[PDB]
């Protein structure tokens, strides 16, 4: 809860994130989900 | 409106999808800009 | 018994300190802030 993310690279089907996405910049998700690290 | 088409508004040319908007343009405003100065809204020349 | 009590008290104090908005995780927030700033600057550079 203490630390909040900006983009986790999940589905963004449909602000700053949309402007980034419309210009060819994307974020990819990590291989190991939080459950596996836990 | 709802199809991916090429558009030419008063010589402003582009490609995309047109939808009805809720933005409150003032009578003297015609264009809307984006963070990268990309046109986002337009007033139709005829139907306003 | 004394050592067990001391360990339990230390763990409780750690919990209390963490939960009272200590803003201790600066190092992990810096990464996110810097990445977001870099991406936003890259996008906003398109107006030049
Ligand atoms: C002609 O231009 C006027 C400008 O106000 C517009 O209202 C109208 O819809 C246009 N078309 C016709 C057939 O009048």
């Amino acid at each position: 809860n203490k630390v909040t993310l900006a983009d986790a690279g999940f589905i963004k089907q449909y602000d700053l994130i949309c402007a980034q996405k419309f210009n060819g910049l994307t974020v990819l998700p990590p291989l190991l989900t939080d459950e596996m690290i836990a | 409106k709802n199809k991916c088409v090429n558009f030419n508004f008063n010589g402003l040319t582009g490609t995309g999808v047109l939808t009805e908007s809720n933005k409150k343009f003032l009578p003297f405003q015609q264009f809307g800009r984006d963070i990268a100065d990309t046109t986002d809204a337009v007033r139709d020349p005829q139907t306003l | 018994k004394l050592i067990a009590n001391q360990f339990n008290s230390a763990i409780g104090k750690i919990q209390d300190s963490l939960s009272s908005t200590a803003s201790a995780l600066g190092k992990l927030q810096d990464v996110v802030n810097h990445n977001a700033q870099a991406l936003n600057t890259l996008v906003k550079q398109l107006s030049s």
Side-chain angles (χ1 to χ4, degrees), chain C residues 19-48:
Chain C
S19 60
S20 296
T21 175
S23 178
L25 296 73
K27 302 190 182 302
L28 305 187
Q29 192 69 28
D30 296 356
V31 177
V32 180
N33 289 348
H34 290 193
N35 299 334
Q37 185 183 13
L39 275 170
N40 281 283
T41 296
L42 190 69
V43 164
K44 195 174 183 180
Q45 198 69 228
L46 290 170
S47 298
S48 302

Side-chain angles (χ1 to χ4, degrees), chain A residues 2-7 15-17 19-21 23 25-27, chain C residues 18-19 21-25 28-29 32 36 39-40 42-43 46:
Chain A
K2 290 305 298 298
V3 43
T4 63
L5 266 54
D7 186 3
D15 61 331
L16 302 167
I17 298 177
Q20 294 174 0
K21 186 180 183 302
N23 288 318
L25 309 165
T26 59
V27 175
Chain C
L18 238 175
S19 60
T21 175
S23 178
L25 296 73
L28 305 187
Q29 192 69 28
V32 180
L39 275 170
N40 281 283
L42 190 69
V43 164
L46 290 170

Side-chain angles (χ1 to χ4, degrees), chain B residues 44-48:
Chain B
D44 189 71
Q46 297 188 20
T47 62
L48 304 182

Side-chain angles (χ1 to χ4, degrees), chain B residues 13-44:
Chain B
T13 60
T15 295
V17 177
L18 302 167
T19 40
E20 291 191 358
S21 64
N22 310 119
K23 296 187 179 186
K24 299 289 173 292
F25 277 24
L26 281 57
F28 73 102
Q29 290 173 339
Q30 180 172 31
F31 293 149
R33 290 283 183 76
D34 196 0
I35 299 295
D37 286 5
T38 309
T39 301
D40 285 0
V42 60
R43 181 186 290 270
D44 189 71

Side-chain angles (χ1 to χ4, degrees), chain C residues 2-28:
Chain C
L2 177 64
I3 295 170
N5 291 341
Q6 290 179 324
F7 173 84
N8 299 337
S9 179
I11 293 287
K13 274 179 64 176
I14 280 290
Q15 173 179 274
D16 291 329
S17 172
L18 238 175
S19 60
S20 296
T21 175
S23 178
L25 296 73
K27 302 190 182 302
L28 305 187

